[PDB]
Amino acid sequence: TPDVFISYRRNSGSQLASLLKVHLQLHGFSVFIDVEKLEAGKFEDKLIQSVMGARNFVLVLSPGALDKCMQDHDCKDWVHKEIVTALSCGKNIVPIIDGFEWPEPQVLPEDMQAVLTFNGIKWSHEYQEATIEKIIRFLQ
Ligand SMILES: O=P(O)(O)OP(=O)(O)OC[C@H]1OC[C@@H](F)[C@@H]1O
């Protein structure tokens, strides 16, 4: 199954998520993005399975991308769910920062606050090849 799971906010990070997918595939990685690889069945089970199956968890932090995670203590938000799974499973989490403002940890549910402790990569529109090279160095 895929080596890289891409988690993104549909309403703001869809273009960067798709750009990451193309580049990572060109460099030889098997990539999961929902619009390509989520197929038939109950998507709750399929999505959690796909996170568990991938060593690497690439989190697209577009502007406001964790907003809907805030006060989502019932864990109904799908980026929240994906992040908790990646954290629980001890995945290699690689945040990609694209205009994202770092929130204070206490605005996030406790089960995902650890996501802010991972070294992130700043997406550079002027130096995209270099950004991709760094992402590939971070992947396992
Ligand atoms: O399901 P929604 O609300 O349409 O989608 P979101 O933009 O809120 O989050 C989608 C992310 O969750 C799982 C992962 F595949 C996808 O990148």
From Swiss-Prot:
Outcome when changing residue 72 to K: Does not affect ability to promote axonal degeneration following injury
Reported effect, residue 41 to P: Loss of NAD(+) hydrolase activity. Abolished ability to promote axonal degeneration following injury
Source domain of life: Eukaryota
Location in or out of the cell: Cytoplasm; Cell projection, Axon; Cell projection, Dendrite; Synapse
Impact when changing residue 19 to A: Reduced NAD(+) hydrolase activity
Domain TIR span(s) in chain numbering: 1-140
Induction info: Up-regulated by lipopolysaccharides (LPS).
Active-site residues, record numbering mapped to chain: 82
Annotated phenotype, changing residue 34 to A: Reduced NAD(+) hydrolase activity
Effect of residue 125 to A: Reduced NAD(+) hydrolase activity
Outcome, altering residue 9 to A: Loss of NAD(+) hydrolase activity
Chain positions recorded as NAD(+) 2 binding sites: 9-10, 39
Tissue localization of expression: Predominantly expressed in brain, kidney and liver. Expressed at lower level in placenta.
Domain topic, free-text comment: The TIR domain mediates NAD(+) hydrolase (NADase) activity. Self-association of TIR domains is required for NADase activity.
Membership in a protein family: Belongs to the SARM1 family.
Subunit structure: Homooctamer; forms an octameric ring via SAM domains. Interacts with TICAM1/TRIF and thereby interferes with TICAM1/TRIF function. Interacts with MAPK10/JNK3 and SDC2 (via cytoplasmic domain).
Function: NAD(+) hydrolase, which plays a key role in axonal degeneration following injury by regulating NAD(+) metabolism. Acts as a negative regulator of MYD88- and TRIF-dependent toll-like receptor signaling pathway by promoting Wallerian degeneration, an injury-induced form of programmed subcellular death which involves degeneration of an axon distal to the injury site.
Protein name: NAD(+) hydrolase SARM1
Shown part of the complete sequence: 561 to 700 of 724
